[PDB]
Point group: D2
Chain length 330, copies 4
């Protein structure tokens, strides 16, 4: 008996088209409906009972918080159904890593949730999307996937939705984690080498069923001669937390520290992330006196991931010590 998998389509390159077969990089995203994606991979019927829903049809660089809530809530309804064994979400690659981490935090289900895209449109020579979709459905239909948290199945890899990131442009090996792939998927079969250590899905303190709005969180970049301008402007326009994408170990310019102190006193959470994204993490109290300033370090999380965690966390708490525990457990 085959697993019941639902594919939730959101758009992306995987649903895209280029003018010619040699257009692997210049294309229009989000053109094909979910039923055309499914019919494009007839071998899906060999591995699962598949049906599709069009949740939205967007280029993922323009995704909104409202899109995330709509998708999170539809994933929760499907996961609660006895007729659903696994869920695949087809997604643009640009913000795939943000959606995957979001769902990893707010979906309290051990049913497999797989997020997948492609780096080339389905019209291109050697398009990667067909096999990525096949692999996603294979992983969503595998008992081995239960309880593993949200997964991403590109480039024959099983990556954790927590810490996989789009790290390489153009190439099909775009998605990498500092902590490695957890497995590989080859000819429909899953091979596992690592397990998640961080809190996710069924062991998460967050639940999409209790979230009807997300706090506004924005991101400012650190660099030589940076000023406090972007930090102040983002807060003046409603940011409840600022993710600092610092140089090095979340380092803050002497030009910017005084603004961040004023902003924290005014209730803006200050979360130190970095643009040093291949490995390591940001250490509390090392580059800045986080205890004295009541700031938070983002640990290993890149700025756009730290934004996702901060927004979900701030649905429940504004206690900077609780936010720091969250950044250490998820």
């Amino acid at each position: 008996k085959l697993a019941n998998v639902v594919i939730l389509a959101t758009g992306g390159t995987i649903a895209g088209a280029g003018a010619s077969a040699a257009n692997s990089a210049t294309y229009q995203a989000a053109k094909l409906g979910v039923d055309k994606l499914i019919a494009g991979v007839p071998e899906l019927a060999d591995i699962a009972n598949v049906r599709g829903e069009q949740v939205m049809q967007i280029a993922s660089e323009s995704i909104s918080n409202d899109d995330l809530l709509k998708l999170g809530k539809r994933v929760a309804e499907l996961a609660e159904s006895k007729d659903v064994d696994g869920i695949v979400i087809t997604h643009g690659t640009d913000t795939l890593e943000e959606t995957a981490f979001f769902l990893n935090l707010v979906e309290k289900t051990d049913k497999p949730i797989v997020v997948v895209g492609s780096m080339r449109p389905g019209t291109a020579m050697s398009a990667d999307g067909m096999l990525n979709l096949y692999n996603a459905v294979a992983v969503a239909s595998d008992k081995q996937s239960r309880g593993k948290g949200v997964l991403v199945t590109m480039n024959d890899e099983i990556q954790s939705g927590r810490d996989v990131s789009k790290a390489v442009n153009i190439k099909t090996e775009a998605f990498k984690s500092a902590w490695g792939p957890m497995g590989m998927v080859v000819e429909g079969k899953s091979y596992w080498f690592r397990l998640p250590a961080k809190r996710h899905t069924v062991n998460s303190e967050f639940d999409i069923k209790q979230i009807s709005s997300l706090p506004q969180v924005d991101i400012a970049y650190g660099y030589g001669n940076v000023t406090d301008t972007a930090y102040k402007a983002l807060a003046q326009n409603g940011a409840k937390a600022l993710i600092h994408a610092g140089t090095g170990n979340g380092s803050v310019s002497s030009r910017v520290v005084p603004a961040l102190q004023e902003l924290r006193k005014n209730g803006v959470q200050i979360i130190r992330s970095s643009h040093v994204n291949q490995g390591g993490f940001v250490l509390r109290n090392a580059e800045q006196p986080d205890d004295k300033n009541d700031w938070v370090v983002a640990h290993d999380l890149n700025p756009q991931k730290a934004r996702i965690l901060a927004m979900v966390a701030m649905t429940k708490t504004q206690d900077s010590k609780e936010l720091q525990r969250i950044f250490w457990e998820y």
Copy 2:
């Protein structure tokens, strides 16, 4: 006869101190004077005739354009001296990559220029600074380094100052290039495997000797639910170019495109970079219609590198086609 090498100290972890030998990650930067650094490595006298100058004493996260120009002008004066064969700059790691690329663009000399730092302070157990500085002096004294552009000598590697970046936090292998190390330095000897392809130093059309001050350039991040606020605020407070650190292939939110069109119409250069920094590059006319909008793509350059090239380039031209040529040649 030994080469004459001048060490220009600017501060950094390499000049830093922690409370104990176990403090490899929690330290105070820019505590030690250049004569103490040099005395810390008595083996330097075996490979070169070294002297030191204290140009500044900063944590590199707080570097300014004024600091870049002071260093750049001092490097120029020493490069013009018949008494100088090579130059080493000791620098904090957080913005080392920005200074190294700046010097690569504006120093019209074939004399070796090496930028070096340490990931651990010199007080730490297994501190990396001593052998990194030894290696920097060895490479700056090597005839094989002439004409290779600015080099970075950490982790026993010879990296190009153009495209090396701080990519891994905490670990001594922090500095990586998408295009690989060009060589290694072991037991004072240099071993080469690749040469630079891009324009630098003697073949650059730019010269520090004509630059009195640099154009203001700022960087805004792209992520889910990003708005145009940072972009507009940075331009309102003097930015002559904005580096867009986009998702994926320099992608721009539909919420942000109209602001960037209006800023370009009002004379602000719009340069599409990305936070996808491990490999690939941003392709002109793929994610956005750069020709229609008169925008520029940053090619493979990460945001902070793209800011440095934009500043130097804009001392010569306001023509977006010329800027694009420069982003494809340097």
Copy 3:
């Protein structure tokens, strides 16, 4: 109330000495006794109650099966002692990955076992051994290390002894896993990101206490124009299994297949590994008909790791199906 950690010294570069501080790569291994190593890191007193035993004093490229067994039996005795909370083994880097996998398979304990070396001798500028040994003792004394299997703590990383390998020559970042580091160790503290998925230590079917001597297993290389000569010679001088370090996916030359069929018919196990060691795995029945020939694939395990597992597996079974199961579970 500090953990009791025993350091078992076996030699290596970490116990080595070079002629001068600039000799990071040219040195004599296995010169310093364990008490000098310990006394070289006085900070060890802050984190554990440490004592040293000299098990052997070798360059690890010359390790024998007799040496492995001697170390494995002494590790078992110490693990069984109420007075020992954790075990550190100082080792040459060349075969560290072999010893670490061996102990992971045969030590039926959840007490931390850490194997550590250095890429530079302790006489070198910026020697890595001091912080590597401090980190090893910190990890061996950490409650988070219990039940995680054998760990390798170099370059500030917590690597699984199963699949970490010496992958980079010269540099301190020598040890890598295809499946990523599991964690990091910074300023004595362990930060975890992944858990092991494969069988080890307390959940292993193997136990050093029943092993009197290991079976002879040898390795032969695959390359253009390779012949059957090495395979036949190693079997003629005692090999009970042959690890084939094939090109690609364990591929075998048409000039070698007949010899390996004859060797299997005569009772020699044939295990297909590869020299493609940065990622992926060898797939059963893909490049060769393993079912028809009664051969075994080594999965993701490199040749020298596959040898270790074959030796341990063959103390229990001669059944090629059971050997394949073992290659898929460990």
Copy 4:
């Protein structure tokens, strides 16, 4: 207008076929003839005037020295023709890296030579071979390729034939170099970032036009408890040089040193390579006294590359000092 490109087919996965579309890893190699290969990519006619020759039809794991010589001599004949601008060789991936280095050493032409394969057969879902072949023909027709030495064009990359290696099994990003890709190929266009440093093609002292036979060279592996058996057997069966694939920095067991000394006195060249293939190199006189023993180190070259260079080099010299020079220049 268009370049004249000749495709020399040798077999491999790129010419392979599997049972179904989801057979990406289980296929039969070397099934499709060159004229079907070319007809499978109708877009080639947009970028070049292409014609095909079937040079051989083999699984590359079974390649012989006679095969290399036949291919090398055909390439020379086509290079010398005014009607050929560029050459593409379709090849199995298992020994692609060996053929690419061989042609880099012996083809004294500045005309582009590109070697290309695929990791999935052309019958498979999301097969990589079509775009790989398009890119190879694009690179072979590009003026930027002239004088760059032999290139390998997989995974959107331009890799040097010298030091690209099959490093990852299964995945399309299989081919990696320690020293980085030199460029990328995207939508038919070549983007360069590095140049070669080592001797090749027109600056090679070697020429296929003067080579009618290749000395027999074989490879033995180093590991724990290794003996001299494989070394002695390989030399007894005609090896004129032995590539030692050592642990670490080409290290040799104390149980193998005396055999290698006796073999060197008997005229067998001893070349120390390693199975440490992700970075670094084997340093002369470090792990063994190469001057005293008259041995050679393979520098950064992996064992199968070192075999190719030794075979070519020993067409000209058996002076160990000249061979070492060649291992330091090529």
